[PDB]
Amino acid sequence: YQECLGRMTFEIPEEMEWATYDASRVWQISKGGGHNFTAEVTAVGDNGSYDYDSMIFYVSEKVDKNEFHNASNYIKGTAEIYQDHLRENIKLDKKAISTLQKNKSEEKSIERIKKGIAEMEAKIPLAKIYEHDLGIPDSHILGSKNIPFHVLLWRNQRVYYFTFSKPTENSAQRIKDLIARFRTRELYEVPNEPGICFPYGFIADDGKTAYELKNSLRFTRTPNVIFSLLTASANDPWQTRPTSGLYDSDFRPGYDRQKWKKSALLDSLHIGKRLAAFEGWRLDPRPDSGERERAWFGLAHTGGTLDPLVAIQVQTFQKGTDDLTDYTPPPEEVLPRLKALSQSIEQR
Amino acid sequence: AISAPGCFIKGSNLFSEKRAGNRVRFFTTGRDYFSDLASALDSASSSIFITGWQVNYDVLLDGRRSLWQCLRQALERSPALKVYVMPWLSPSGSLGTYDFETMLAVFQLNAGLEGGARAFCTPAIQQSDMQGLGVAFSHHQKSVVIDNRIGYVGGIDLAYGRRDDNDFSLDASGRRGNDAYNPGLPHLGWMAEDEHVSSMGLMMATLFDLSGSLFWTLHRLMQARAGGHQQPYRYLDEAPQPLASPDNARLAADQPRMPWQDVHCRIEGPSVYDLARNFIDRWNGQQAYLAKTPALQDTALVRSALEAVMKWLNSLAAAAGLENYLDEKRNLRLELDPPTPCWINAPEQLPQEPEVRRGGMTVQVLRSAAARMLEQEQAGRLGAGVNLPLQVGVSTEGVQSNCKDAMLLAISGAQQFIYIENQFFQSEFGKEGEVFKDLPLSGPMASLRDVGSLRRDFVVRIRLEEALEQRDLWLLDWAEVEKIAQEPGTEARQFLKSMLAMWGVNAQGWLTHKLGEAQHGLLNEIGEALARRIERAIQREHPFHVYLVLPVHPEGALNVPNIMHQVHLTQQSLVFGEQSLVKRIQRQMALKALEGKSDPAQAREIIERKDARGRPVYEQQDWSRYLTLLNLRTWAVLGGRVVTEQIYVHSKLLIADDRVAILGSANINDRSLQGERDSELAVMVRDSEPLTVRLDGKNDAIVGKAIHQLRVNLWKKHFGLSQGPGGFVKPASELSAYLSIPAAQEAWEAIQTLAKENTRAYERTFNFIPQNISQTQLQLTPEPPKGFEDGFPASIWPTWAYRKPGELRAGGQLMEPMPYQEIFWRSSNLTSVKTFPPPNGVSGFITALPTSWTRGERNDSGLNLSI
């Protein structure tokens, strides 16, 4: 009963589930937002980063090869539609210049519009989408004319997408090395070598290259309350902040003072061995009339300057927002289990 | 009304029924309406009722005389005149900075008038279900009825920026003061060095001349009116000096005004009685509401306030002169005059019941109102002892949604074509498509929304998070804000103003959230009405069409979160949403084209999976067979620089088979269409004379002539053909043939191609204007020769560039100034201003509507859908 995220491992008190990409959204993964629980009980931005040529990856839930094909179909359709738009611009410009050339009309702009057309046509061929093979079982690998990127994979009914913002001339070499080092993994399984731990995956390395992962967590007993785990290396090139996706609206929610009452939430919670603060808020019903609903928020983020940054964000979801049909338990009911989980976090 | 199966609305809560024998004269520009209003007021003899969303007396009617001047001349001419004015009242001091001088102008309207007080003013209080959320609601009723015989209704309220000519000119030097309307730009002029009139100066001057129940007592002293000679005012009676904004800044010479397109009508007949009954009932209801006794504590507070005001006036040695009415230079008692409402129970003021006449132009008056408003009007009728005779089918308790139900019935009864020209578009669109909750908040919106993202070290010292949460100026730390102001750095110096603006925006963020629970979704059903009619046309496979003309973006700058959220909801309703108008049309067309070899229940899933492009089946269909969404734009040269500006389509006009020309003041948002929030006056005019027309070029049709001419003139202006010589926009003469054919396809194909050509020319010249594909992407670190051809959709600020749109860990910024910024227009010495080569090939004012603007970008402010 233990799991690892990023480079840290922890012990889980009871049954748990990770957040993976939406099966209904798998095909449009080039526009990646992140993993989610369901449509409405998600968080913002659950995905991982790696310093190997500015790498980002996502993990899908159980999908099939039809959706795996639909993903590359969408990636191709994007470039197709851009080509169509580019061609219609050329058509409109040609009609405009044909109407312009009429009996010594506007001068000193024909060269301008012609050089514009020249640029517009020069940037035409680079938008073609080319597919590759690379000798990888069941991989829809894409890329440019020579430099490849946008990796795809399908193992154990999962999807692994690996994109690199700055691939060089040896991009195929680098990405095939990386996917050679890649290895699938299973829930409640923790390896014994340095690498990266994300839900249902592990890539081994020397254990020193920078990383940044974030995911959300939820007990199967209490679906109304979720916890999102944040991990990153020390002094990473992205300098991710402890909040990272809260937008100063979950800090100060709106409510009617007539039927509910709010209060601060400062508790005690030590992660690993070091002690951490817990600054948030609590929403409590008032005994004036029948009000049985709750909500609260909290965040603890000790670390980062020398050790890997570890942040825990607690967020509650109201009854009836989704398939969940249970009232929100008060914080004191579920905080003991969070304390039990937080004390068992250690780095490899 | 027998030439078509479609008839008026016929329910129970209807305010009134159709009345024939009406003389209807439509108006297409504001100038014509103002001129006709001046002439009618010059003809006025007996009684005038005025109601409007915003009434201003600074406006010029005929170009030489203002509204207050015309009204005063009417009063001088008629010794038995009776004027009642009923604007809309904001429950707070002011929602914005429109004006606040209407009450004092009506006060000065009785100054020096022989005889008793023949004029009365009564601000209108909104009335809805619970009003806790309803404080924000208003009255959108516009009407002027003259001598119970001539009435007006439309969307053009007697306000600034409404009087526009056929040319659609961008030059603002001609207009005076507050008449140069352009909310988008930061106005950078200045008028009141020594010429114009300060807004505060005249009101404190009127306080000097005199020598929350404050509004109640001010209207009480308004009712206790000194109609005799008190003082000849220079600035409004012999020296008509223009007013100014609170900051008294104007639109600069090289800054374009914002053109304004609206429609209006004049009526004469028995329906003027309908409008007069509406005004009288509302006036009586508001008087009865006023009859309630206010709080004694509030009365004492107002007494102390007026005592302090008169003490300050006495301390002002120059101001402490002489008084004669109700004050007597402090030698009299206090001001607690007993209330005495002035009803409209006089038999002269009561309109006579009009006879039923035949033919002409039948008109119906439509109202939306709340149960509270109706019960207040019943209370007013009982209190004043006034009960006008009513037709059979009218109700007085309940709710009205006459505008919404009327639009629904016209949609359900239309046969060939519909033309719409509106201001807003907010209906149901399903659950949002291409936008998801896991997706990070957009670039610009996140910059506006999050307050700790920028300068974490500078925010952790001020620690004003708790201050802004608790909403306390004293809790705001003066020491920390002063330390940050004194911190070194020009960027810090700008950051002080930026964070002051952020506090101004975010000070009140808890208006009404948990009134029940947070929900999403629009309520009114005009969009799905269009979709259902279009789908019936698809199902029967016979020609039908619908247009929509709307503004590019709502009034104001594009850096205001509520305006951005309205753009989000507009795009979701139009196209983006998963069950939008385009999606519903595409689904029906796919279902039709796939009805050959497909099981009934199976097809509902067969139309769903993707093609080789990866996109679902129904996305392959072309909706341009049922929809032509268009906007309006122009350009000019002011002061040696190329400028462009949108034409705000503020009209609320609607056409139904060239037989009906709807008009009024109901938008396409819930706040106006649902009925329980806001009140309005829309009319539903019906013709009575037949005219032949070759609508589709092959089959003859029998429609009206006034409606046909109104639509022809609307298009004629819309294409630049009606404007005068010398303009910067050439006419679209090739559409003079196609204007009269709304059912032939070649007409809409021609207009659509012209729209696309105009859009392409504008895109070639400018890049800050809204378009689909961002042009600031090229100005970045990535090099073109490597092989970077992505073409990202433009954001809500089209110069904003995205390094990676999918997430927010990358981020971006603006690469070139936006028009609402100051560095756009002001040639700062430390930088160099950017100019653009003149555009070419641009004919007409209509341009394509950008449906890839803000694609996959999350612009939600988190504020109430109602407010």
Author numbering:
A (entry chain B): 26 to 373
B (entry chain A): 28 to 238, 417 to 1072
From the paper:
PldA, a phospholipase D (PLD) effector, catalyzes hydrolysis of the phosphodiester bonds of glycerophospholipids—the main component of cell membranes—and assists the invasion of the opportunistic pathogen Pseudomonas aeruginosa. As a cognate immunity protein, PA3488 can inhibit the activity of PldA to avoid self-toxicity. PldA is mainly composed of 27 α-helices, 25 β-strands, twelve 310 helices, and many loops, folding into three regions: the core catalytic domain (CCD, aa 24–935), the peripheral helical domain (PD, aa 215–441 + aa 647–721), and a small C-terminal domain (CTD, aa 936–1094). Compared to the open conformation exhibited by PldAFL (pre-open state), PldAtruncate presents a highly open conformation (open state) and the PA3488-inhibited PldA reveals an almost closed conformation (pre-closed state).
To understand the structural basis of the intrinsic activity of PldA and the way in which PA3488 inactivates PldA, we next determined the cryo-EM structure of the PldA–PA3488 complex by single-particle analysis with a resolution of 3.05 Å. The structure of the PldA–PA3488 complex indicates that both proteins tightly interact with each other, burying a ~2020 Å2 solvent-accessible surface area, and PA3488 acts like a crab claw to clamp the HKD2 and CTD domains of PldA. Four interfaces participate in the formation of the PldA–PA3488 complex. The specificity of binding is due primarily to a salt bridge between the Asp643 of PldA and Arg50 of PA3488, combined with complementary van der Waals interactions between the Asp643 of PldA and the Gly70 of PA3488. The results suggested that PldAD643A and PA3488R50A dramatically decrease the PldA–PA3488 interaction, which is consistent with their functions in stabilizing the PldA–PA3488 complex through forming a tight salt bridge. This is associated with a translation of the lid toward the active site and a rotation of roughly 140° (based on Cα of Ser121), so that the backbone atoms in the lid region are as much as 4.8 Å away from their counterparts in PldAFL. Coincidently, activity assays showed that the PldA almost but not completely lost its enzyme activity upon PA3488 binding; hereafter, we refer to PA3488-inhibited PldA as “pre-closed” PldA. Of note, the α5-α8 loop of the PD1 domain in the inhibited PldA is structurally invisible in the electron microscopy map, implying that these helices are highly dynamic after PA3488 binding, and this accordingly imparts flexibility to the lid region.
